[PDB]
Design a protein around this nucleic acid. Structure first.
Length: 342
DNA sequence: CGGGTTTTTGTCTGGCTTCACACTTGATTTGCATCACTGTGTAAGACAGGCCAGATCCAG
């Protein structure tokens, strides 16, 4: 817990709320800029590099067989190492306010002189495909030497029937179904769980060997931020998979929280949004066991007077137990701070 | 495809209004053309080129 100011280069206007920092072997990379990419960097992926408390965003290139995906403002990021380390991107929101549904897979194809070359391959789904949506979260699951993705519901626009031009930007939470996506083939399947009763968005999901921990979130159906955490334990036999969910005591009511990993089988979460005009300022610690959980309240960081009164704040995860968050200014549009918690 | 029964009107009828209608000229009052100018055009992005830095290579 140690705040620190971070200066910026010339291209500060390219950062916007909802970006996604991706980490590949120590190097943190930027994605999800504002507007369509210009001739400064046609790809849109930037080398997120901080040195001497100073940010320097520089362009990056793709391979000769990649796919130039549009910048997304609320994708679903997750790590996947099952080989070549690679990330997964689903959903998002294009700069034309259009929701995407295609899955993109990032990967490092070549590198030299500290200059990487990405490989963005397109991935399509079959069977029970999910509605294009944002604010959701996807995780990976390992079971009996086999991988599988878990996609929880989020929010999206009106369906193609009731959507009218007088409410063209209305948003409703998607149905609380669990989607299992096989990355090797591309076949998704929708399951129903009686425990999942209401839609949830902007939540935080913790992944492990074979169980996903959904903690907190925001429900648009009733405008309530619940304080219940879920435990979706799955299994991958030779036959059809089986999913189960059990509610658990001791939840947390936070929306738009930023999660990061500190040690092996241990996570720390920072504040998000507690109420509409009330802002969560104290952090929480998540300690895992083998079939149990544990939450506690760490020492509150030495917040500054500008953050203590700012209404909006956003950020993401760098990867080395470090959080990069920003504060809006006036008319220098954002003030970006970093946070290290070992 | 046209018979009854009221509406809808121009007159017949001649005799009472209130406005209409020839001339001036000297003003007096309106109406309209003319002339040199006006505002709204009002922040960033693409590209080539010199410059060191540092990586790339040479030979004792």
């Amino acid at each position: 817990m140690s705040l620190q100011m971070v200066t910026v280069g010339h291209n500060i206007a390219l950062i916007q709320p909802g970006f996604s920092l991706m980490n590949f072997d120590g190097q943190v990379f930027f994605f999800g800029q504002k507007g369509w990419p210009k001739r400064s960097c046609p790809t849109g992926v930037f080398h997120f590099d901080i040195k001497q408390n100073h940010l320097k965003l520089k362009p990056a290139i793709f391979s000769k067989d990649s796919c130039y995906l549009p910048p997304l403002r609320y994708p679903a990021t997750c790590s996947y190492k099952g080989d070549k380390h690679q990330y997964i991107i689903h959903g998002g929101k294009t700069p034309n306010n259009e929701l995407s549904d295609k899955i993109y897979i990032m990967s490092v194809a070549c590198k030299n002189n500290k200059k990487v070359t990405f490989r963005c391959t397109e991935k399509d789904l079959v069977g029970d495909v999910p509605e294009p949506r944002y604010g959701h979260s996807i995780d990976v699951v390992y079971s009996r030497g086999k991988s599988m993705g878990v996609l929880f519901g989020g929010r999206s626009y009106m369906p193609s029937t009731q959507r009218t031009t007088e409410k063209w930007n209305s948003v409703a939470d998607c149905l609380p179904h669990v989607f299992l996506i096989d990355f090797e083939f591309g076949c998704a399947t929708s399951y129903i769980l009686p425990e999942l009763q209401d839609g949830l968005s902007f939540h935080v999901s913790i992944a492990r060997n074979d169980t996903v921990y959904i903690l907190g979130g925001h429900s648009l159906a009733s405008n309530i931020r619940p304080a219940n955490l879920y435990r979706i334990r799955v299994d991958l036999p030779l036959g059809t998979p089986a999913v189960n969910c059990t509610v658990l005591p001791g939840g947390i009511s936070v929306s738009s929280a930023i999660l990061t990993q500190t040690n092996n089988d241990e996570f720390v979460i920072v504040g998000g949004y507690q109420l509409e005009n009330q802002k969560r300022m104290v952090c929480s610690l998540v300690s895992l066991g083998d079939n149990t959980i544990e939450i506690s309240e760490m020492e509150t960081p030495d917040w500054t007077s500008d953050i203590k009164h700012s209404k909006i704040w956003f950020g993401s995860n760098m990867g080395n137990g470090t959080i990069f968050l920003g504060i809006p200014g006036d008319n220098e549009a954002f003030y970006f701070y970093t946070l290290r918690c070992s």
